[PDB]
């Protein structure tokens, strides 16, 4: 054959530049990014930066040619184009003064659905359960986010309803096996089909919203996460035989509209699920019911809230410096004891966590030689030096695990 060019094959065709891919797709960067997020496409590091390009040392992001080529045939592009055409037509109608025509046009529109995207991105339910970690982590945070100009209140309400559905299913299924509390929030873990899915529930305080973060990307991710969560919830309810979607409890919604509402029905096999069995609890006002109520409900206990009006209870939770009544029939407990019980999975004695006492720390449940190294090769010598430098940090951590722990105790 004729003289082939210096670099026009191999990495030069397997990867396509971001700008080149966008130009070939004839799609705006916003729409391309949305499609990428929906498909989960990501940039890849070429084996040789200067070989993928034509000797260019300038920075670049290399995508997979096959992935982009396959993405070009997805219906989502057609739906996006239809949405753009509908938007232009609605703008024309609004500018023409025919509000009724605009209302009729808008009322007859239908949005796209990502159901087929899920069946190809996560062909099997275990994969969806594995990847639901990020979806839960985002939805739980968005549930407590107050409504703003960047996100309509309907989206926040839908996210909160999805989170409530998930929490109710978990409590009824009692699949929770490990819990933890952190500054960033309260971590919850459930053995959903043995996948030990973990999610972080942030504190219910008013979530500060820094305007720097671009909500457009966040909303795009949240849409896919909400669809995935809805499908997973439907699948789980069908597998368990419970009705779906469960009906909200209007009577309970008036009081606190907490986890108690949204009752579910059909149509104790583990130490975690058997703890607190048949127990009745009373939560003081100052303790977060939203956090403790879920744990007790999953454990199979009963909780009486102070707001029940806004005894027979064998356990009481209060964080006040001084308890007022101290009825002998109620066992006063700090939430740290409840957390420790779930972490260990056994009924640790309650006498160690009386109110007002010290709070114990809470931990998560999860030349002889130099002589022979003179002749080592450059690669081996560098590897050994880097390994020693890395192990220096491990040794420092091991030393510090006891140094301060012993020094502070003496004072």
């Amino acid at each position: 054959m004729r003289i082939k060019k210096k670099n026009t094959r191999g990495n030069a065709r397997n990867f396509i530049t971001r700008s080149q891919a966008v130009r070939k797709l004839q799609v705006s960067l916003a729409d391309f990014r949305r499609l990428c997020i929906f498909k989960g496409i990501y940039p890849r590091e070429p084996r040789n930066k200067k070989k993928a390009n034509k000797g260019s040392t300038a920075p670049t992001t290399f995508y997979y040619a096959k992935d982009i080529q396959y993405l070009m045939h997805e219906p989502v592009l057609a739906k996006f184009r239809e949405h753009k055409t509908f938007a232009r037509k609605l703008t024309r109608a609004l500018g023409r003064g025919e509000v009724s025509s605009a209302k009729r046009l808008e009322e007859n529109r239908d949005s796209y659905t990502l159901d087929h995207i899920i069946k190809e991105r996560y062909p099997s339910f275990p994969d969806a359960i594995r990847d639901i970690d990020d979806a839960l982590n985002m939805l739980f945070l968005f549930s407590n986010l107050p409504s703003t100009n960047q996100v309509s209140s309907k989206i926040i309400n839908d996210a909160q309803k999805i989170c409530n559905q998930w929490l109710a299913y978990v409590a009824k299924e009692r699949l929770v096996r490990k819990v933890f509390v952190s500054i960033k929030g309260v971590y919850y873990q459930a053995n959903i089909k043995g996948e030990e899915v973990r999610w972080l529930v942030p504190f219910k305080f008013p979530e500060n919203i820094p305007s720097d973060v671009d909500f457009r990307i966040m909303l795009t991710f949240l849409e896919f996460y909400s669809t995935l969560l809805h499908f997973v919830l439907y699948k789980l309810y069908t597998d368990s035989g419970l009705i779906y979607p469960p009906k909200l409890d209007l009577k309970k919604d008036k009081i606190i509209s907490g986890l108690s509402s949204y009752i579910l029905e059909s149509r104790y096999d583990s130490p975690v699920a058997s703890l607190f069995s048949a127990f009745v609890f009373y939560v003081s006002r100052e303790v977060p019911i939203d956090i403790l109520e879920f744990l007790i409900l999953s454990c199979g206990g009963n909780v009486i809230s102070e707001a029940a009006m806004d005894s027979k209870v064998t356990h009481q939770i209060v964080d006040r410096p001084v308890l007022k009544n101290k009825v002998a029939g109620r066992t006063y407990i700090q939430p740290q004891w409840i957390f420790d019980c779930i972490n260990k999975g056994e009924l640790v004695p309650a006498n160690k966590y009386l109110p007002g006492e010290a709070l114990p720390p809470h931990l998560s449940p999860w030349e002889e030689k130099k002589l022979k190294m003179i002749m080592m090769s450059n690669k081996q010598k560098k590897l050994y030096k880097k390994m020693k430098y890395s192990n220096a940090k491990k040794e420092e951590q091991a030393e510090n695990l006891k140094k301060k722990k012993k020094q502070i105790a003496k004072q």
Binding site: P202, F221, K235, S364
Partner: protein, 101 residues
């Protein structure tokens, strides 16, 4: 019928078996990030300046651990939204590579 259909059914195929597909790994589990950690984990007053003076993303921990006497006294996190936004950005903009540890 919105979402009232089991698109998974008895599916048993896998997509991660593709040679060039990288599995959707999950973030590492938490370890000693409690609101009431051991006193030894407290950062010294002099190290606070060093911790704060470092540039973003070159930091093992993006928060300063503190000792809280009670659960109710724990304040709301002031960086939750930023961390989740960064995680979402990395989920699609971070170059994924296959490496042997």
């Amino acid at each position: 019928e919105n979402y009232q259909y089991d698109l998974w059914g008895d599916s048993t195929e896998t997509n991660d078996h593709v040679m060039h597909l990288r599995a959707p790994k999950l973030p590492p589990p938490t370890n000693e990030e409690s609101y009431n950690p051991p006193e030894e984990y407290l950062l010294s007053p002099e190290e606070k300046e060093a911790w704060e003076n470092t540039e973003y993303s070159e930091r093992e921990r993006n928060f300063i651990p503190q000792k809280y006497s009670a659960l109710r006294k724990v304040p709301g996190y002031g960086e939750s939204i930023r961390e989740r936004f960064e995680r979402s950005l990395d989920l699609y903009l971070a170059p994924r590579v296959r490496k042997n540890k």
